Amino acid sequence: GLTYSQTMELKDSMLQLDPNAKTWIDIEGRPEDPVEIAIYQPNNGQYIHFYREPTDIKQFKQDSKHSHGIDIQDLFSVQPGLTSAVIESLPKNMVLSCQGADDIRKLLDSQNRRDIKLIDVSMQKDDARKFEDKIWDEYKHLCRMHTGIVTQKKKRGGKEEVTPHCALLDCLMFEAAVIGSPQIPTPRPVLSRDLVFRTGPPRVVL
Ligand SMILES: [Ca+2]
Ligand SMILES: [Zn+2]
Numbered sequence: 001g002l003t004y005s006q007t008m009e010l011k012d013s014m015l016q017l018d019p020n021a022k023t024w025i026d027i028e029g030r031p032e033d034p035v036e037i038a039i040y041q042p043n044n045g046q047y048i049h050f051y052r053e054p055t056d057i058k059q060f061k062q063d064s065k066h067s068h069g070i071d072i073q074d075l076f077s078v079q080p081g082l083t084s085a086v087i088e089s090l091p092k093n094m095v096l097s098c099q100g101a102d103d104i105r106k107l108l109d110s111q112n113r114r115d116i117k118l119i120d121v122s123m124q125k126d127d128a129r130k131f132e133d134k135i136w137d138e139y140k141h142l143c144r145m146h147t148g149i150v151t152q153k154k155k156r157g158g159k160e161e162v163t164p165h166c167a168l169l170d171c172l173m174f175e176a177a178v179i180g181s182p183q184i185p186t187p188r189p190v191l192s193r194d195l196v197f198r199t200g201p202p203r204v205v206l
Contacts (some may be wrong), residue, residue, distance in 0.1 A: 001081035006195060010082075013190045016046055019091035024171040025098050025118075028068040029054065031107035034083060035070060036145070037201035038094070042175045045187045048086060049168045050196045051078045051145065069148035069164030077198045087111040097121055099128050099174050104161055123177060131176035135169050138182065142189070143168050197200070 002010065017023070021104050028182045030037035035054050040047040053075040054060040064070055087108065093115050098104050101120040108116050146164035175184045 002085055010085055011193055014048065014089050016190050017041060018044060021092060024174060025096045025104055026167040026170045027104060028165060029063060031103040034107065036167040037083060038171050042184055045185045046190050047187055047192055050082045050191060053078055058073055061185050066150060067150055067165050068134040069145050069146040069150045074145055076156050079196060079198055084111060087113055090116060095119060098185050099123060108112055127179050128174055130164055131173050131182045134182040135173040135176060136163060139169055139172055
């Protein structure tokens with residue numbers, strides 16, 4: 001799990017969030033086995049974003065192919081235990097905005113955070129992604145984990161290749177849809193990379 005200095009840094013980093021500010025939350029993966037979480041405050045730009053290795057490899061392969069496009073191999077070096085640690089430290093009675101609340105509600109309740117309230121902004125699914133292309137054009141550098149091809153079924157038949165779903169860029173584009181343009185304030189990560197990923201192997205000497 002997390003060490004001591006680590007945990008204290010995580011808690012300090014999160015205090016950078018304004019407990020009364022508008023805050024989006026989005027996850028990828030099922031709520032019992034999430035693989036990517038983002039918590040984003042558009043007014044000040046601050047976001048908490050991290051990953052988790054799945055326990056169910058089979059369901060993970062389907063989500064990779066039909067939702068997030070993450071390669072399981074790229075999750076082998078994430079820091080364990082962040083999901084429970086972050087959820088435990090969220091401010092009391094915080095009000096979070098989301099696009100579809102049912103799975104997030106289950107995740108939060110599973111961690112005994114029934115005090116956190118959810119506002120389902122309830123945009124139609126295409127409207128919610130109006131600014132998808134613009135947000136990837138501008139912010140792709142903020143998450144490079146979505147490497148695989150993603151296809152989804154259309155209701156009225158057939159399938160199509162779509163842009164992969166990223167918890168972070170989904171928050172950014174949902175804010176863009178609400179404000180009617182991609183001109184959100186500059187987003188900035190609150191977590192250091194060393195809290196998100198295990199220390200990598202030593203660099204190759206080139
Ligand atoms: Ca999403
Ligand atoms: Zn992502």
